[PDB]
Ligand binder design. Structure first.
Ligand SMILES: [Mg+2]
Ligand SMILES: [Mg+2]
Ligand SMILES: [Mg+2]
Ligand SMILES: [Mg+2]
Ligand SMILES: [Mg+2]
Ligand SMILES: [Mg+2]
Ligand SMILES: [Mg+2]
Ligand SMILES: [Mg+2]
Ligand SMILES: [Mg+2]
Ligand SMILES: [Mg+2]
Ligand SMILES: [Mg+2]
Ligand SMILES: [Mg+2]
Ligand SMILES: [Mg+2]
Ligand SMILES: [Mg+2]
Ligand SMILES: [Mg+2]
Ligand SMILES: [Mg+2]
Ligand SMILES: [Mg+2]
Ligand SMILES: [Mg+2]
Ligand SMILES: [Mg+2]
Ligand SMILES: [Mg+2]
Ligand SMILES: [Mg+2]
Ligand SMILES: [Mg+2]
Ligand SMILES: [Mg+2]
Ligand SMILES: [Mg+2]
Ligand SMILES: [Mg+2]
Ligand SMILES: [Mg+2]
Ligand SMILES: [Mg+2]
Ligand SMILES: [Mg+2]
Ligand SMILES: [Mg+2]
Ligand SMILES: [Mg+2]
Ligand SMILES: [Mg+2]
Ligand SMILES: [Mg+2]
Ligand SMILES: [Mg+2]
Ligand SMILES: [Mg+2]
Ligand SMILES: [Mg+2]
Ligand SMILES: [Mg+2]
Ligand SMILES: [Mg+2]
Ligand SMILES: [Mg+2]
Ligand SMILES: [Mg+2]
Ligand SMILES: [Mg+2]
Ligand SMILES: [Mg+2]
Ligand SMILES: [Mg+2]
Ligand SMILES: [Mg+2]
Ligand SMILES: [Mg+2]
Ligand SMILES: [Mg+2]
Ligand SMILES: [Mg+2]
Ligand SMILES: [Mg+2]
Ligand SMILES: [Mg+2]
Ligand SMILES: [Mg+2]
Ligand SMILES: [Mg+2]
Ligand SMILES: [Mg+2]
Ligand SMILES: [Mg+2]
Ligand SMILES: [Mg+2]
Ligand SMILES: [Mg+2]
Ligand SMILES: [Mg+2]
Ligand SMILES: [Mg+2]
Ligand SMILES: [Mg+2]
Ligand SMILES: [Mg+2]
Ligand SMILES: [Mg+2]
Ligand SMILES: [Mg+2]
Ligand SMILES: [Mg+2]
Ligand SMILES: [Mg+2]
Ligand SMILES: [Mg+2]
Ligand SMILES: [Mg+2]
Ligand SMILES: [Mg+2]
Ligand SMILES: [Mg+2]
Ligand SMILES: [Mg+2]
Ligand SMILES: [Mg+2]
Ligand SMILES: [Mg+2]
Ligand SMILES: [Mg+2]
Ligand SMILES: [Mg+2]
Ligand SMILES: [Mg+2]
Ligand SMILES: [Mg+2]
Ligand SMILES: [Mg+2]
Ligand SMILES: [Mg+2]
Ligand SMILES: [Mg+2]
Ligand SMILES: [Mg+2]
Ligand SMILES: [Mg+2]
Ligand SMILES: [Mg+2]
Ligand SMILES: [Mg+2]
Ligand SMILES: [Mg+2]
Ligand SMILES: [Mg+2]
Ligand SMILES: [Mg+2]
Ligand SMILES: [Mg+2]
Ligand SMILES: [Mg+2]
Ligand SMILES: [Mg+2]
Ligand SMILES: [Mg+2]
Ligand SMILES: [Mg+2]
Ligand SMILES: [Mg+2]
Ligand SMILES: [Mg+2]
Ligand SMILES: [Mg+2]
Ligand SMILES: [Mg+2]
Ligand SMILES: [Mg+2]
Ligand SMILES: [Mg+2]
Ligand SMILES: [Mg+2]
Ligand SMILES: [Mg+2]
Ligand SMILES: [Mg+2]
Ligand SMILES: [Mg+2]
Ligand SMILES: [Mg+2]
Ligand SMILES: [Mg+2]
Ligand SMILES: [Mg+2]
Ligand SMILES: [Mg+2]
Ligand SMILES: [Mg+2]
Ligand SMILES: [Mg+2]
Ligand SMILES: [Mg+2]
Ligand SMILES: [Mg+2]
Ligand SMILES: [Mg+2]
Ligand SMILES: [Mg+2]
Ligand SMILES: [Mg+2]
Ligand SMILES: [Mg+2]
Ligand SMILES: [Mg+2]
Ligand SMILES: [Mg+2]
Ligand SMILES: [Mg+2]
Length: 84
RNA sequence: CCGUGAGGGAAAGGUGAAAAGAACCCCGGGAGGGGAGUGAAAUAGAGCCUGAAACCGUGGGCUUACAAGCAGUCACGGCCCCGCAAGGGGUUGUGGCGUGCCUAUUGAAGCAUGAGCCGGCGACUCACGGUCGUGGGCGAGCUUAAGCCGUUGAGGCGGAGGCGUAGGGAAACCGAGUCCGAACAGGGCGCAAGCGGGCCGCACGCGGCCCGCAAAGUCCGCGGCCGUGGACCCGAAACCGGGCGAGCUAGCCCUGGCCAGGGUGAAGCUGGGGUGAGACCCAGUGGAGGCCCGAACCGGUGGGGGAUGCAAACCCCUCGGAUGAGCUGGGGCUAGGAGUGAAAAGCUAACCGAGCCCGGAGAUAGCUGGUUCUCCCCGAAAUGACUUUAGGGUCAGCCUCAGGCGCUGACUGGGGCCUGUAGAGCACUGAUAGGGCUAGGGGGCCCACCAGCCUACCAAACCCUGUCAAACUCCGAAGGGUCCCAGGUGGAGCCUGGGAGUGAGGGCGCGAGCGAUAACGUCCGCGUCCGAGCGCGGGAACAACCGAGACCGCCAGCUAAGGCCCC
RNA sequence: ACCCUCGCCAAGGAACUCUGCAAGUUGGCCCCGUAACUUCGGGAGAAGGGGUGCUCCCUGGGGUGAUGAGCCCCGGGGAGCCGCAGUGAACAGGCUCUGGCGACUGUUUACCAAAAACACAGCUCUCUGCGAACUCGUAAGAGGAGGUAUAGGGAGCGACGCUUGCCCGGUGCCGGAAGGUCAAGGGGAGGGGUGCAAGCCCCGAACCGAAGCCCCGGUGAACGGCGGCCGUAACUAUAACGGUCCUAAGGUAGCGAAAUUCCUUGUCGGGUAAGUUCCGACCUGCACGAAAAGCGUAACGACCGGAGCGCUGUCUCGGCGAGGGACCCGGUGAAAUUGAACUGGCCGUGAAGAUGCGGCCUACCCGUGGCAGGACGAAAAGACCCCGUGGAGCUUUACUGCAGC
RNA sequence: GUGAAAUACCACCCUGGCGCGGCUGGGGGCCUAACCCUCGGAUGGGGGGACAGCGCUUGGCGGGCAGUUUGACUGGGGCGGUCGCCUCCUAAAAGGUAACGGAGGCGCCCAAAGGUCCCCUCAGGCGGGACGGAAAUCCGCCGGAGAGCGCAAGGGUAGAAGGGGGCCUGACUGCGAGGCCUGCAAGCCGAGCAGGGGCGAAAGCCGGGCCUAGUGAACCGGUGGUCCCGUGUGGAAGGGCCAUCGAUCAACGGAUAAAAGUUACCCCGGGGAUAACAGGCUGAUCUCCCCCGAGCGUCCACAGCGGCGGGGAGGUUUGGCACCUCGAUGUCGGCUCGUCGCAUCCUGGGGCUGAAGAAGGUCCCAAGGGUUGGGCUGUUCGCCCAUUAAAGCGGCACGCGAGCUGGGUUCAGAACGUCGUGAGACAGUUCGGUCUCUAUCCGCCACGGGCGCAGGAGGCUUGAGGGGGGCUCUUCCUAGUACGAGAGGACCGGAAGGGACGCACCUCUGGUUUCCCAGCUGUCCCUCCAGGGGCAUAAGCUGGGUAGCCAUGUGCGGAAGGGAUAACCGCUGAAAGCAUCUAAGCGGGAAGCCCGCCCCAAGAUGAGGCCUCCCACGGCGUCAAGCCGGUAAGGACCCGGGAAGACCACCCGGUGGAUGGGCCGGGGGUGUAAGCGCCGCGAGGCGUUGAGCCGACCGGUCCCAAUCGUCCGAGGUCU
RNA sequence: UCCCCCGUGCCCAUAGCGGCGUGGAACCACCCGUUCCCAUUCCGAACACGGAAGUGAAACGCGCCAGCGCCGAUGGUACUGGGCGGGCGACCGCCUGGGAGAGUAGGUCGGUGCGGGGG
C-alpha cells in the first residue's frame, strides 16, 4: 500500500458562462424590443433605430428588418431598417 | 413432540352398493404369495377410489470399446417397425454447424449469483379519495346518503347533502368584469359556443323540434396512473410493552458432609550446663503452618490424538492445588440497563457490549433476491440542473399511446452576416540566440574635475538577423451557427393530454486536458457501433475492426468484406 | 502404502527447530555431603557421590503374656553366595547458572489467552457526630449495624527495604459576608384598553429580590504539567554558573538502546569457530522517573529470555518389530455436495487464469488401491475495506432532557 | 507671592461619613404546642423544634441516566484540499461543455465615484530645465492611444466611459410592448404612457455608477404606514396589505430553534459499483544490453573502462490503473516435492588481453549435470564460522496450508512508551492465543477386468516410440621439462585415488528380529518340595539373537565409441587481375545435439515377427457362423503354496506328487535342561553336559494335506 | 454647365505622416483692440466681443515626390468539409471540394454627393 501524502491545488474555480454574442443577424425580421446583440463593451455600436442598455445591450425599437454595417475605424453597427 | 418455564407446535381424511373382509388346499417358522371363493370391478384385498412426475427394475427394438463433449441441429446412409402405395415412426454410422438457464452487468460458456431432480404452495390486490381515458343515462342540470316501506337472490321511496351554472381581490367588496394604480395609461387573471344539420308549422319566414353530445356538466360502469393504508412478495442488525427463568453459571444465607500416607518441626514447656543471679547454649519434649511430597477430591500446563467425534470441549501422556481465600450434598435469596462479578464486559439454562417468550408487528430495509400464458406494432436512457446528493430522487432530454394541426422535419441548393480554431505572424503582452550601436557599472592610459581614451568581461533601451505562446494576435481558412427563399409525404415535424423507463455506460476514430502524448487509464467535444444486433459473413478463435440491419419458407440466382494449394 | 499407540537401534549427540517442541535422562529408601545469597524461616531432595538381593552366625531394645515361651515391632555387628543387573517387575524429580515481571498461597476470559492480568496482607488520601455517610426502593422499609473514629463508605498504590522531588496558571475539591452578573417574587415613576362615570382589565422604568459562574485564598499519595532557547571552565567536548518564556514551573534521587531506543544488529566488553537474541557496560532517554509510584530485594512461579551438564530418533538419516485401522469376505449401511455432463494436453483466445472457442497434440471400453496440482474444489449471502442520511456498546467541557443534590 | 485655580465674608449645591427615623431585606437567641426521635405500653415522660421532613413553585449543578447528532466531493477511505459568486484559458472561430486541469479576484465601495450642461485630452520618447531620483510641477516639439477609468481579469473607450467647473437628486412613483437566459425560480435588456421633478437656449438626456463579482428562497418575528378582517354589538387584542429590518442559513437551492467522539466487544444490509492478496493492462521506477566517444589507461578512445547525453529489451521491485473474483481467489517465512528460463556461479568450447608461465580479466558458445554444513534473527535478505569446482540469478497464484508447519502479521486478554480530558488509539513494542477422519471429476502413481488384433492356441521375440542416466575434485607420470632474471610453473597425453549421487545386494560390518534361548522381581495358581503356567504393553524387566527386511556395510554405474553441429579456426575460391572461410563445393570444432548404455513398450487398432500345436459341417438360417450343443489344441474353476501380492495379477505344485504341514539330519541362536549323585548348616557349587530347548535357513522322508471332479473353448467372411 | 474658395456629409490610409510648390483679388485665417455680452484653476493663449492699419509668416487650401506608413497580385505552399489508407507509436499519405499567412512583382501622396460666394 503506497499513498504518500498527496499534494493539493486551489485554482480550480471558474465563472458562469454568460451566453453573450449576436442574437439576431441581418435579414432577420424583429419586433420592437428584440435584443439583437448582447455584448459586454461596445463591440457593436447602436445604429439607426437601435437602443443601448446599461450593458451596451443593443435592442431594436422599430418593427422591421435587421442589418449591420462596417464603418472601419468607426466601429461596426446594427440598424433595423423599418418594414416600409 | 420441544423448552427448566413463559411458550412453541405437527403430521394424519376416501375398500365396496353391500364385509359379501377371502372357508379350504398348496410352498413357508412367519411374512408373503399361488390356487379356490366374494364382487359389476380385487392392478376396489384392506392405511385398499383415481393413482401423475422424479426415482428403481424386467423384457424387447436400434446402437456403441480409435475415439474429443452445452450432448443438440441440418444432410445423407444402415437396421427395425407401420401401410397396397406415396409416405410415416424408432435408432444412429459418418459429414457440416454449434460457448447451458436465470440473475446481475459497460461486458458472462464463463473460473461472477441461484438451482440435486420431480410434484404441490409461492409475489402488483382491495377500500376510500384523486386524475386522465372510456361505455352509457340526463343534461341548465346531474345525483342522493343515512334511513323508511317491499322482497327473502324484487325493488321502490328518501333532496339533508355534493358537484356544476362567474371570475377577480389578502380582504371589505365589485361583477363580465376584476386586481395594482390618481389614471377611461398600461398590464395580470377573467368572457365573449355555435351547429354538421334531417324534418317540418308548411308567415317566400325557419320557428324550433331535433341533433352530437356540446354551450357543459354530472351520474353510474370499465380501464390506466396517483394519494392514504403492510400496498408487488420474502429478508434484517435492532426499538418498546407485559411476562418466564439462578434444576447451567456468579455471589451470599441455613443446615450436613470430605481431605490415604508420609516430611518439616514454630512457640511453649522440662532437664543439664551457665552466672553473683541472669541472659543464653545445648539436648528432650511439643505439634504450629493461606508449610512440603502425594492419592481421593478440585483443577486444566505443554504435546498428540479427536475434528459428519465416544463427545456441540472428549481421550491419552504430562502438569497446578491438595488444613484452606479448600472441596462437596440438601434447603434458600438476588434478573434484564437489572443481578452477580478475587474484573474477562465474565457468567445469568450448550452463541450475553444487554437473557428468553409472547405482543406492538406484515417495525423499517433509498439494499439483495424473486416476480408465473401467447402473438402483433413502436422502442429508450446511462446526459443537464438541483439534491446531508453521489448505486436514491425532482424537473428537463430521449420512448410510447389518444386527439388535434397539416409540409412546417432531418438532409440539401442559393443568398446575407455573425466567429477567431487550424495555419501563420510578431504590430500588442511576454519569451528568445547572436550581432550592431550604445545609459550605466568591474575596470583600463590616466592630463585630474572640466571633460577624458581603451576594454575577445557585466550590460540597458534601440535597430538587424533568426525564432517561441492554451490564458499573445497586424492576420486568418476549412468549417460551423442563424434567418430568408427552394427541394424534401417521413413510424418527418408541431400542439394538448395519458403511461413510462433512464439518470453505473463501454469500445473505436478524431479534437484537447490529466498522466509519463504509459495504461483494456481518466475527463470533456463530434461520430459510430455494443448496450438492446453475444442474430448472420469476414477477421483462426473474439460485445463494439471490415461486411451487413435476421417477418416465415425454398435441394434456385447475383453479390459484400474476405478469399480462390490441401484442411 | 499411509495413519495412530507402542518397542529398539551403528557412529554422532541439538548439527533439529521460532523453541531440546516431543521424547528420553533422572526417579523410592538409607548414609555421607552440600555454594552465592538471605527477611536467618530459607536456597536443601541444592549439587556430588556411596549403599540397596539372598544365606548363615551373633546380639540389643521395646508391645502383648507373666517378668519365661509364643506372637508382633523396630535395630546393631560377622562371615559368605549368585547374576549383565538386587526400589532386579509396577508406582518413581533430569540438574545447574543468569536476566524480566509479580512479593508469597490464591483468582480469571465454562468452549482458542492462566499471564507481567484480578485478588492479596500493607501504605496514603477522603467522606461519616450516628435517624452516620453510602446502597436499593416511588414509599414503607432494609442493608450499613442491633456497629459508633482502634467504625463505615469511597479512591489509588500493592509484602518488605531505601524513598517518593519541582510547578497551585487552568480543571476539581475545601474555605472565603469586597466586588461583577443572575430566577420566581416584591416594588410600582410612567403609559394603555374600554365605561357617562365610579371603575374593571392590562403594560411597565428606579430599586429590593437565593444558590450559581466570575472572583480571592488554599490544596498534588486531587485532574494534571516537568518543553525549550541563548551565554559560560587551563585543546576539543561538556557546563557545576548565569540569562530567557507564550504557560504555573522546567525532571531531585534512582534507573536507562529497558515489556520503554525511531536511527538500531547503537558502541565497547563477555560468552560462541561464528551471537539482529542474551549478560555487563556507556548515555544522543525519537518518547524512564517516584503511590496509572522510582529503585532494589531472600523466597515463591505449569509466566517470558539466554546459557551450560546429562541424555536422547530432534536431526545427519533412515531401519525393523508390535498392536489398532487401512486392504478382502459375509451382515448393516450414512454424509456434506450435486444446472446438466458424452468432464484430456499445449499454445492461444475469451470479462484479464476454460474440459466446453481456435489450431494442433495426445487418447480403445470399465474399474480397484493410492497422491493431492486443477475443477478460481467444499463449508460460512467476507469478520478486512467501502457504501447505507443501517444498528447497537462505550466517552465527553457534542445537543437536549431526566433522576438526584 | 505661589499656583491650573485663591484665600475675609455670602449662598446655592456636590463627595463621603455619622447619627434618629419611616420603606424593604437578611441571622441569631429563648419558648412549646404543631411536626421528628426517643422512654420495661405513654391521654403520659424525655430530647430536637417551627428547624428538619413533606406539598406547590424559582433558578442552579447534573454522562448517574436517556434519546440523538456528528455533511458531501474524493482515481478506495482517511489526512490534506474543496463547497456560493466574478475574469481568462482549457472549449475543437455560434451557444454550451468535464477533471483534486492551468492563473487570479468577490462577500465591498461612492452623496459624489450619481443626473445634466459647458469646457478640457493622455502615456511615454527627445530637448531645455532652481532644489530637481531615472517620473514632482514647467516650456518646446514628436506621440492615436500603449495613459486613465476605486479594486481581479477580460471586453470596451479620447468623435470619452477619462480630466475640470455650475446647478441639481431620475440612487423617482404608477406601469411596462417586446425580448436575452433558462428544467423549476431566479438573472438580464428595456422602448413607450401617466404623475411630479433635474439640468440645457434648444434638440434632448436622467428609472444610479463603462460593463461583467460585492450575494441568500421560504418560514418566524420587529418597526413604520395602510383602515381591509376583527368571533352577539361597539372598541380593543391579534392578523392582513404596502414599506423595511434580523442569515460566514459561506456545506452559500438554505435538514432541527437546538448536536461531538469511540468500538480490536462489535452487529445487519449491500459492493468485486471500491481498497489490501494474487492475476491482468502499463512499464515511470527496477534489472539487463546497445549507440556516441569527454576522458582514463606510461605511450594509446574501445585490454579493461565510458563524462555529458541517446535507443531498447525484460516484467522478478516499488508503484499507476481498478478489468474477473467481496452468496470468500487463505496472507509472510520455513519444511516437502519438483519443474522451467538463461540474462551462466562451477564444469565443457572458444576470441581479445595492458595473455611470458602459472593465476586473472573480458566477451562469445553452452544449462548436461552440479550448486555444502553451521552461528544470529520468524525472517526473505543479509552479516559472520568452516569448507568448496561452485557456494548462480529468476519463473511457476512473490510454485507448493483439500500436503505439513504456524515462528512473523490482522480478533477477543494483559502491559510499556506515545497520542487523547475521555472512551480508546499506534505500518511502535511486549506475553498468550481452536488452520476443518471421508477425493466425485480432471491430473498423477500403481494394479486389474472387458473386448479388439478378420482361424483358435502354447512359447520366444522386433522395437516404432517413451523413460532413466549424464556430476566433479585431488595427486602422481610426462617434467621441476616449453616459459621464466627470479619466484614460480603449463599445454597435449597417461595413471591412481576421492566426494556427492544412482541401481542392486546381505558375504562381511552394523541394525532390528512381539516369544528363538536364558537370567530376574512381585503376586495368583498347578501340586506341598522341586519343576512350571498367567499377569505386571498392545513384550512384565534384563542379556542375547537365525531367516527376512535393512545402511552405517558390499558390488556396479556416469562411459568408451560413431555421427551432425555452436562459438571459433581453417582449405580451395570468384564476384572485385589483388584479398576473402562463402557466393559453388571441402575440413577441424563443445560436459551440449543424435546414436550408443540400462528399463518399459505392438491398444505401434499402422494391433508387427519367428517356433511348435490343434484343426474340420457333425445340425441348421439369407450356406463357413449370420448357428446351436458337444469338441480339439489349449484354458479357467477348485486345491497346496510362493523373497509374487492390498484385491486382482504373476509364478510353482496338485498323489505320474516333495507344494505346504509334520518327522529326520544339518545350519543357526541360546550357553551346560530336568532328574539323579557328591560338597556345604545354608544361599549355592561341582559332575553327568556344550547339555537342554530350539521360528523362518540348506536338504531328506509320502506320515498329514493338494480327495473326486466340472465348465469353457476350432470348426476360420475377401482378388 | 466649367475652374477657385467657404461651409457639409459619405467612403474610412491606395483617403496620412513627413519633405518641396504655391495661393489671398475674393472668401478664411493671423491680426488691431478687449469699453461693452462673455471669459481663464492664471493668461482675451482658449472661449468672446468691436473692429479693420498690415499679412499669408503661422494655420489652412491646392499641387509635387516615394522614404516611412499603407494597399497588395499571380503563382506555390500550410491548413482543412467530405472520402479512402499507412505506422508499434510520435505521426504520416492518396482522392475530391475550399484555401490562407507571410514573401515577391506592383499599386498609392485620394474619390465623391448637397448647398453657398466668386471668374
Ligand atoms: Mg440606459
Ligand atoms: Mg424440556
Ligand atoms: Mg367372478
Ligand atoms: Mg375402484
Ligand atoms: Mg366411488
Ligand atoms: Mg389405489
Ligand atoms: Mg490413430
Ligand atoms: Mg470402432
Ligand atoms: Mg450482482
Ligand atoms: Mg444494461
Ligand atoms: Mg463451470
Ligand atoms: Mg456459474
Ligand atoms: Mg453479488
Ligand atoms: Mg439467480
Ligand atoms: Mg420444482
Ligand atoms: Mg413444481
Ligand atoms: Mg377509485
Ligand atoms: Mg416482507
Ligand atoms: Mg420488563
Ligand atoms: Mg446457585
Ligand atoms: Mg499446603
Ligand atoms: Mg471416601
Ligand atoms: Mg489438559
Ligand atoms: Mg490437541
Ligand atoms: Mg489438537
Ligand atoms: Mg488434523
Ligand atoms: Mg501436593
Ligand atoms: Mg436488557
Ligand atoms: Mg422486557
Ligand atoms: Mg453491581
Ligand atoms: Mg472470583
Ligand atoms: Mg455485568
Ligand atoms: Mg451459557
Ligand atoms: Mg441494546
Ligand atoms: Mg405499528
Ligand atoms: Mg418483517
Ligand atoms: Mg418488507
Ligand atoms: Mg426512495
Ligand atoms: Mg423498429
Ligand atoms: Mg396522432
Ligand atoms: Mg419548405
Ligand atoms: Mg444553406
Ligand atoms: Mg498554432
Ligand atoms: Mg420518432
Ligand atoms: Mg452519471
Ligand atoms: Mg463509470
Ligand atoms: Mg460516473
Ligand atoms: Mg475506459
Ligand atoms: Mg486509451
Ligand atoms: Mg444499435
Ligand atoms: Mg456483432
Ligand atoms: Mg459470445
Ligand atoms: Mg469469425
Ligand atoms: Mg428488417
Ligand atoms: Mg458468382
Ligand atoms: Mg543411536
Ligand atoms: Mg551407542
Ligand atoms: Mg541451532
Ligand atoms: Mg538449520
Ligand atoms: Mg519438554
Ligand atoms: Mg538373589
Ligand atoms: Mg491390643
Ligand atoms: Mg517409587
Ligand atoms: Mg519423585
Ligand atoms: Mg512427581
Ligand atoms: Mg504472582
Ligand atoms: Mg499460584
Ligand atoms: Mg478459555
Ligand atoms: Mg497458572
Ligand atoms: Mg488454556
Ligand atoms: Mg426517599
Ligand atoms: Mg443490625
Ligand atoms: Mg496496581
Ligand atoms: Mg506460573
Ligand atoms: Mg488460457
Ligand atoms: Mg462443444
Ligand atoms: Mg481411484
Ligand atoms: Mg487424502
Ligand atoms: Mg485447493
Ligand atoms: Mg412522646
Ligand atoms: Mg414529648
Ligand atoms: Mg417535646
Ligand atoms: Mg420547612
Ligand atoms: Mg449517552
Ligand atoms: Mg465557444
Ligand atoms: Mg465549435
Ligand atoms: Mg422566466
Ligand atoms: Mg366584537
Ligand atoms: Mg508480472
Ligand atoms: Mg462461489
Ligand atoms: Mg547465453
Ligand atoms: Mg596462461
Ligand atoms: Mg493448495
Ligand atoms: Mg503466530
Ligand atoms: Mg500455538
Ligand atoms: Mg501458555
Ligand atoms: Mg527407440
Ligand atoms: Mg502413444
Ligand atoms: Mg548381517
Ligand atoms: Mg544382518
Ligand atoms: Mg550382524
Ligand atoms: Mg490371571
Ligand atoms: Mg537376523
Ligand atoms: Mg583464400
Ligand atoms: Mg564443417
Ligand atoms: Mg566431424
Ligand atoms: Mg489404439
Ligand atoms: Mg499384437
Ligand atoms: Mg502378433
Ligand atoms: Mg513338502
Ligand atoms: Mg517337507
Ligand atoms: Mg551350534
Ligand atoms: Mg536342530
Amino acid at each position: 500500500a503506497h499513498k504518500k501524502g498527496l499534494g493539493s491545488t486551489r485554482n480550480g474555480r471558474d465563472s458562469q458562462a454568460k451566453r453573450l454574442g449576436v442574437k439576431r443577424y441581418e435579414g432577420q425580421v424583429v419586433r420592437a424590443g428584440n435584443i439583437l446583440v448582447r455584448q459586454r463593451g461596445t463591440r457593436f455600436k447602436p445604429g439607426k433605430n437601435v437602443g443601448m442598455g446599461r450593458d451596451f445591450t443593443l435592442f431594436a425599437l422599430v418593427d422591421g428588418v435587421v442589418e449591420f454595417q462596417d464603418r472601419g475605424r468607426l466601429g461596426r453597427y446594427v440598424h433595423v431598417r423599418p418594414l416600409a
